[PDB]
Amino acid sequence: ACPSQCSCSGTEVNCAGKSLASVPAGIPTTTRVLYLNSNQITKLEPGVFDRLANLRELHLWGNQLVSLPPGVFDNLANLEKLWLNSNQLTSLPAGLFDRLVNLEHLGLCCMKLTELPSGAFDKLTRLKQLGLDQNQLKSIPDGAFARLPSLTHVWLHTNPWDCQCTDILYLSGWVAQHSSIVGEGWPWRHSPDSAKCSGTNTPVRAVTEASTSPSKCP
Amino acid sequence: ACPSQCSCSGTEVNCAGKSLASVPAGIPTTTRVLYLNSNQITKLEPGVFDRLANLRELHLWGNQLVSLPPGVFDNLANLEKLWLNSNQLTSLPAGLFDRLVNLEHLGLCCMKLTELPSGAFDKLTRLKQLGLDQNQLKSIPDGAFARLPSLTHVWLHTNPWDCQCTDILYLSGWVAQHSSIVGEGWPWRHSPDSAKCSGTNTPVRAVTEASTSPSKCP
Amino acid sequence: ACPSQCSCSGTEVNCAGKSLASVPAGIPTTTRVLYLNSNQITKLEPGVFDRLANLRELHLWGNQLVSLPPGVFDNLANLEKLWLNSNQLTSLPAGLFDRLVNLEHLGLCCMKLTELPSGAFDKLTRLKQLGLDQNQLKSIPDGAFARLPSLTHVWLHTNPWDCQCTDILYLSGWVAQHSSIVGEGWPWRHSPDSAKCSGTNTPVRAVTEASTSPSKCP
Amino acid sequence: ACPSQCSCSGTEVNCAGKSLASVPAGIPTTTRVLYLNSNQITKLEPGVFDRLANLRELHLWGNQLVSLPPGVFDNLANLEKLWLNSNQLTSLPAGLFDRLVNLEHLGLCCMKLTELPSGAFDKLTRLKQLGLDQNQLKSIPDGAFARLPSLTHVWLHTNPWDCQCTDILYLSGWVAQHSSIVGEGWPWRHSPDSAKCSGTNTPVRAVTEASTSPSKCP
Ligand SMILES: CC(=O)N[C@@H]1[C@@H](O[C@@H]2O[C@H](CO)[C@H](O)[C@H](O)[C@H]2O)[C@@H](O)[C@@H](CO)O[C@@H]1O
Ligand SMILES: CC(=O)N[C@@H]1[C@@H](O[C@@H]2O[C@H](CO)[C@H](O)[C@H](O)[C@H]2O)[C@@H](O)[C@@H](CO)O[C@@H]1O
Ligand SMILES: CC(=O)N[C@@H]1[C@@H](O[C@@H]2O[C@H](CO)[C@H](O)[C@H](O)[C@H]2O)[C@@H](O)[C@@H](CO)O[C@@H]1O
């Protein structure tokens, strides 16, 4: 069992760099590590992974995804690493990650996200590493990181953070307090000022309530 | 806290690419993932990892190691991934890996290994992935892979296999039998003929007893 | 979501000691630890566990199972502990355990096993503990423990080992050499002579070929 | 190697029921599961476990410990189950459990604890099961369970909860809210009214602020 375009042995399936335009059929049920990265996949069918309950790592980075079906990861209860970096997402459905209670690494950089849904990470009690850098994020919803007790590495740089708007105060206070975990590069390197306000290029960590106004919020 | 040159958060310590000449002091005891790769480390003190029992991943690839103290990994009972690729090793001490009973990935490519000690891998019951490519190996000892029952991926290419000598018959037989797991690249791709006789450019797995002679052994 | 008769919280489902005659419906898909022991279950529906792929521990001990459907554990790739002790089995279907590649504890004591299928344990590479005591075993198939390299604990006592028959020599030779792992009790206690010949009270590990004859075998 | 009083194979050491008055010498450094239960151990040397970094399960239950040195569990970073049930502890040093970031079951029942230290469980992010039943507890410190996001099973019965005192209100409000995880027996069975006020036999989760007064707090 192995899609003809891929290499498969043991519990690892390598479909990387194969000019794939869709997720191939015949990925074994027993697969733990799935490389689908660096292809030209433009969409996921709902249910494409329903059958792949055993996955520990899902590598989807460097594809062309423009949206993700709601529920698409819902059977992945064992998933430990989810790499979605360098796709073309502009948003994420609510509840996307709620079933990924064992997730330890989540990569969401280098796309075009304009916001995150309000409860996006609330179930990710084991999450350690979270990559949000290089998107179009202006704010982080209030409380968004409050249920991430295992978090030790985060990436926030290269987002047009809107520091004139009162919405930024959650993040700006959070970064000030969790400043040892804010970084850049791969693997992570400590970089606490790397989250910067749009237009002023000043640190998000240094924004005050005085310098913001409800009137600056869209 | 953290070695001065490195970034540390959670249980991950990143000292990669820091022009290091030795293994820095102050790596916390709780470290699980240690990146020491891409430096200019020339040697390891005996005992350097004795206080790092919690390591799961040890990235030592791309350094200048020429030998390894015997027993240097002996405390690493939880070690799951050991990357020694691209160092300058010409041999491995006997018993080097014997304590590593939970090892799942072992990278030994791209150095100058001229042989393997006879029992090298006997204890690695859980080893899934083994990289031996790009060395100076002419032969594998008889029975060398017999006690690697969990092995699903192996790299053997780019070694001067000496197929005129009768010693090559263990390996040639083994490769023919375990064809499905022999490969190339990162991540692994199926490539069972990548192991070639030096010169004749015949695949190792196609060698017959008839073409070999004990008189051609060094 | 929880069977009415059971208690459920997190990923543990306790249906133990509930006077059940069958496996109840409504066991969540996310269940990792499933207690069905100490009931009056007499049989399993084929497919009963097809949906429970996240199981790590399956406690079926102290029921009244007389047979097991083939393929019944086939979807349990993450299974780590399987406890079938004190049921009423007289045999096991071929390949019953083949998909259980992560299995670390397998209990099969205290039933009515007359034999084991030839390759029963061949895939259980990570098996550490195996309980075969208190059955009706006369011999172990030649080679039956050869593909159990992770094995550190085994129980063999209280079986009518037929020491007149030459088939016992696999076992007797194996025990003599793996003597440190043979034992008794819960948790295990070292007990190398506990496995004894039927009628003679002679330890199985001391049997000689001189006392046995192919003429006394099946 | 094994202590002479005990039985050992693989990574399990069985010193249970051996009339031990102290922790014996010669427990291997590679030990993962250590049974020191049902002995007559009355204290632990500071540093006794410093060398046992690989422990996953520590069974210390049914001895006669009266105190525990602070720092004693500090090197047990991999510890997943800690069983201290049925000793004679009346208090726990502050920070006792702070290094046990991977602990999933903690048994503290059936002793003489008269209080818990304020931040006792603050670091136990993965704690799933916590046994506090059968002690001398009158209240639980404010916020004590707030940093146990993984907690799915708790035992609180058979404690003389002082419901007349305002200090009970954290606990009563907590039990009402987390009612589905409150239980009894082994394995856990659901039993939310099992925690009862002394004298009144009123479930703790049913206490009102009106029935309590800061004047009844000694
Ligand atoms: C997408 C890419 O450029 N490379 C991948 C790595 O990317 C990094 O991810 C972290 C965490 O999400 C962070 O956002 C970095 O800025 C980003 O480069 C990483 O996802 C790995 C996973 O193994 O794959 C690519 O190398
Ligand atoms: C630059 C280098 O050596 N690459 C490392 C990766 O490499 C490969 O390792 C596999 C497994 O042994 C095989 O030998 C390949 O030929 C080799 O390129 C891989 O080990 C990663 C994991 O950290 O490290 C480097 O990237
Ligand atoms: C009576 C019974 O089946 N007890 C179960 C325990 O039994 C021990 O199991 C081991 C290994 O199979 C060995 O066979 C012993 O003889 C037997 O007593 C044990 O399996 C536990 C596991 O949680 O369940 C019952 O207690």
Q: Ligand 3 centroid to C134 CA: how many Å?
A: 11
Name chain D contacts of C180, Cβ cutoff 8 Å: 9
Residue type (1 letter), A43: K
CB of C38 within 6 A of ligand 3: the answer is: no
CB of B109 within 6 A of ligand 2: the answer is: yes
| Ligand 2 atom at minimum distance from B106 CA | 12
| Contact criterion met (CB below 8 Å) for D88 and D64 | yes
Judged by its nearest atom, the ligand closest to the C-alpha of residue C187 is 3
Q: Is C53 on the interface with A (CB under 8 A)?
A: yes
Tell whether D85 is in a known binding site. Answer: yes
Residue D8 neighbours by CB under 8 Å, 6+ apart: C190, D1, D2, D14, D28
Chains that touch A (3 or more CB pairs under 8 A): B, C, D
Tokens of B3: 């070695």
Sheet containing A81-83: order of strands: A7-9, A12-14, A33-35, A57-59, A81-83, A105-107, A129-131, A153-155, A182-184, A189-190
Chains that touch C (3 or more CB pairs under 8 A): A, B, D
| Ligand 2 atom at minimum distance from B59 CA | 23
Tokens of C120: 């029963």
Residue C193 neighbours by CB under 8 Å, 6+ apart: C203, C205
What φ, ψ does residue B12 adopt, rounded to 5°?
-115, 130
- Of the candidates D2, D10, B124, D33, the residue with the CA atom closest to the CA atom of residue C129: D10
What φ, ψ does residue C67 adopt, rounded to 5°?
-140, 175
Exposure b/e, C186-210, CB count within 10 A at least 16 = b: ebbebbbbbbbbeeeeebbbebeee
- Which residue's C-alpha comes closest to atom 10 of ligand 1? A131
Tokens of C184: 């008794």
CB of C192 within 6 A of ligand 3: the answer is: no
Q: Is A165 on the interface with C (CB under 8 A)?
A: no
Residue type (1 letter), A54: N
Residue A74 neighbours by CB under 8 Å, 6+ apart: A50, A98, A99
Sheet containing B12-14: order of strands: B7-9, B12-14, B33-35, B57-59, B81-83, B105-107, B129-131, B153-155, B182-184, B189-190
Q: Ligand 3 centroid to C10 CA: how many Å?
A: 25
Name which of C30, C54, C77 is nearest A30 (Cβ-Cβ): C77
Concatenated DSSP letters of D143-206: TTTTT-TT--EEE--SS-B-TTBGGGHHHHHHHHHTGGGEEETTTTEE-TT-SBBTTT--BGGG
Q: Ligand 2 centroid to A180 CA: how many Å?
A: 30
Chain-chain contact of B9 with A190 (C-beta, under 8 angstroms): yes
Substitution site in C86, C105, C106, C109 for ligand 3 pocket (most atoms within 8 Å of beta carbon):
C109
Which residue blocks in C99-179 are alpha helix, DSSP H?
168-177
Tell me the residues of chain A between 138 and 157 that have a Cβ less than 8 Å away from chain D. Answer: 147, 149-150
| Contact criterion met (CB below 8 Å) for A148 and A182 | no
Quickly tell me which residue has 């009270």 as its tokens.
C201
B65-70: long-range contacts, CB 8 A cutoff, minimum separation 24: B65/B41, B65/B89, B66/B42, B66/B90, B67/B43, B67/B91, B67/B93, B68/B44, B68/B92, B68/B93, B68/B96, B69/B44, B69/B45, B69/B93, B70/B94, B70/B95, B70/B96
Judged by its nearest atom, the ligand closest to the C-alpha of residue A59 is 1
User: Residue B200, by phi and psi: left (phi above 0), alpha (psi -120 to 50) or beta?
Assistant: alpha
Torsion angle, alpha carbons of D83, D86, D89, D94, to 10 = 20
Sort strands A81-83 and A105-107 into parallel, antiparallel or unpaired.
parallel
Tokens of D41: 């151990």
Residue B152 burial (CB count, 10 A): 19
Beta bridge partners of B132: none
| Contact criterion met (CB below 8 Å) for D54 and B102 | no
Residue B152 CA: distances (Å) to CA of A7, A13, B29: 12, 12, 32
Residue D131 CA: distances (Å) to CA of A123, C14, D154: 24, 17, 6
Chain-chain contact of A7 with B35 (C-beta, under 8 angstroms): no
- Record the resolution, in angstroms: 2.2
Residue B157 burial (CB count, 10 A): 19
Residues with CB under 6 A from ligand 1: A 61-62, 83, 85-86, 107, 109-110, 131, 133, 155, 186
Taking the CA of residue B16 and the nearest CA in chain A, the distance in Å comes to 8
Q: Ligand 3 centroid to C63 CA: how many Å?
A: 13
**Furthest-apart CA pair in chain C: how many Å?**
62
Taking the CA of residue B125 and the nearest CA in chain C, the distance in Å comes to 7
CB of C174 within 6 A of ligand 3: the answer is: no
Residue type (1 letter), A12: E
Chain A interface mutation, best of C11, C29, C98, C99, highest count of A Cβ atoms under 10 Å: C29
User: What is the rounded CA–CA span in Å between residue D192 and residue D184?
Assistant: 9
Name chain A contacts of C29, Cβ cutoff 8 Å: 77
Q: Is B12 on the interface with A (CB under 8 A)?
A: yes
Name chain B contacts of C125, Cβ cutoff 8 Å: 125-126, 149-150
Residue type (1 letter), B138: K
User: What is the rounded CA–CA span in Å between residue B171 and residue B160?
Assistant: 13
Residue B203 neighbours by CB under 8 Å, 6+ apart: B175, B192, B193, B195, B196, B197
Chain-chain contact of C78 with A78 (C-beta, under 8 angstroms): yes
Q: Is B186 on the interface with A (CB under 8 A)?
A: no
| Contact criterion met (CB below 8 Å) for B30 and B55 | no
Name chain D contacts of C187, Cβ cutoff 8 Å: 12, 14, 16, 35
Residue A174: in which H helix or E strand, if any? helix A169-177
Residue B67 burial (CB count, 10 A): 15
Residue D22 neighbours by CB under 8 Å, 6+ apart: D41, D42, D43, D45
| Contact criterion met (CB below 8 Å) for A90 and A114 | yes
Torsion angle, alpha carbons of A59, A61, A66, A67, to 10 = 30
Tell whether C122 is in a known binding site. Answer: no
| Contact criterion met (CB below 8 Å) for B8 and B14 | yes
CB of B85 within 6 A of ligand 2: the answer is: yes
Burial of B119 (0-12, 13-18, 19+ CB in 10 A): middle
Residue C35 neighbours by CB under 8 Å, 6+ apart: C12, C13, C14, C15, C16, C59, D187
User: What is the rounded CA–CA span in Å between residue D166 and residue D139?
Assistant: 10
Tell me D216's DSSP state.
Answer: G
Substitution site in C61, C108, C124 for ligand 3 pocket (most atoms within 8 Å of beta carbon):
C61
What φ, ψ does residue D127 adopt, rounded to 5°?
-65, 125
Residue D123 burial (CB count, 10 A): 18
